Curated annotation (Swiss-Prot):
Signal peptide: none annotated. Involved in the first step of pre-mRNA splicing. Required for cell growth and cell cycle control. Plays a role in the levels of the U1, U4, U5 and U6 snRNAs and the maintenance of the U4/U6 snRNA complex. May provide the link between the 'nineteen complex' NTC spliceosome protein complex and the spliceosome through the U6 snRNA. Associates predominantly with U6 snRNAs in assembled active spliceosomes. Binds directly to the internal stem-loop (ISL) domain of the U6 snRNA and to the pre-mRNA intron near the 5' splice site during the activation and catalytic phases of the spliceosome cycle. Disulfide bonds: none annotated. The C-terminal RRM domain and the zinc finger motif are necessary for RNA-binding. GO terms for cellular component: Prp19 complex; U2-type catalytic step 1 spliceosome; U2-type catalytic step 2 spliceosome. GO terms for biological process: mRNA cis splicing, via spliceosome; mRNA splicing, via spliceosome; positive regulation of cell cycle; positive regulation of RNA splicing; spliceosomal snRNP assembly. Keywords: Cell cycle, Metal-binding, mRNA processing, mRNA splicing, Nucleus, Phosphoprotein, RNA-binding, Spliceosome, Zinc, Zinc-finger. Present with 2650 molecules/cell in log phase SD medium. Changing residue 180 to D: Inhibits cell growth. A zinc finger (C3H1-type) spans 66-93. Changing residue 72 to Y: Inhibits cell growth. Residues 129-221 form the RRM domain. This is Pre-mRNA-splicing factor CWC2.
Amino acid sequence: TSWRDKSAKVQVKESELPSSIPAQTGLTFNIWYNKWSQGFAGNTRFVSPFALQPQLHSGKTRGDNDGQLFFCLFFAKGMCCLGPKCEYLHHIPDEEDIGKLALRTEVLDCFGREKFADYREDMGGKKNKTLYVGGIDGALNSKHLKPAQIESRIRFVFSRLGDIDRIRYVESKNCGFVKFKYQANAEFAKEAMSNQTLLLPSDKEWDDRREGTGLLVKWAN
Ligand SMILES: [Zn+2]
């Protein structure tokens, strides 16, 4: 069923989230989120207990009916408690959405925040659409998988987040590179896949997925 033909699913209960829930573009979002992350055990990047399931979760929100052009950051991370009440969009950014955003802004990402490029230090190397995906082995709890299997999992989880230009898994570096057709999908996928497991419900290790190390997802250089 098309996301257009349903209302967005509530992903978590508000009571599951830490208090002082911030606006996604708000002053304290990173303080709050970093605190959330640091609250987990132990030393490597936490494995988020929440995840976006695009087919299951995507749907209409009040945002769709209220002229909203920007996407819900909590939704991308699998942790929006609002569902159809949300005033931000709950679907995977598409060509239409992106066209409207282009008329609306040059300086904001798909979540309405300042684009990375406008404040980050350019280490050196025009619309970056490529993500570096690191710590693949750790996101699988060191499960013994082969490159064909590993590549299929990276492809599966990222391709459901937007049209893919190219994906590469690089065994020797324990990493992957995912290039989206559109910058908006890269922006969205980066937030969606950060700290995610790459285990699947069918894996023997699934119940112990928290004991891995969440994926590292950065802009590729
Ligand atoms: Zn939302």
